[PDB]
Amino acid sequence: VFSGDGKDFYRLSGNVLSYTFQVKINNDFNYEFYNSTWSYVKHTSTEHT
């Protein structure tokens, strides 16, 4: 078997029926970004004379 994605030559066998040199690759990306915030302010004043 010739050079496929490797060294000069490989060696097959009688029991092995096939050696294949087809390239396929799958990828995935699932990015999620969250950011919450809270800001509460309360003030009171009372003066009597």
Binding site: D5, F21, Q22, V23, K24, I25, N27, F29
Partner: protein, 123 residues
Amino acid sequence: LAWEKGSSGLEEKTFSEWLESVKENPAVIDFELAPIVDLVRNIPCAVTKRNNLRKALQEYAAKFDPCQCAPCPNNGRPTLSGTECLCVCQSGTYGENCGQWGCWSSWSTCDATYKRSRTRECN
């Protein structure tokens, strides 16, 4: 390129390297077909086992057909591999399970003439 896909932004730098890699090692995409029974020609008893292989292929096509598999969500082509049916996802579809011809009919009774028919439905 597959790893950089996460930040693609329509990248083109690694596209030339991918072109070179495919030039070094392509993959089967398009192809014309022909019956494998025509390849056995130089064996001791060629015609006998050739006709036997034709009969075996006829009976195998009668046994297994793509119509036996359940249909696919969006125009997918189901294929039978062993005892499972996988849907071939086309461009624009994804997922583990992503008109088509139906099943053939039973062979009608052999008429007085040679003419025997079988019908398939596009349902």
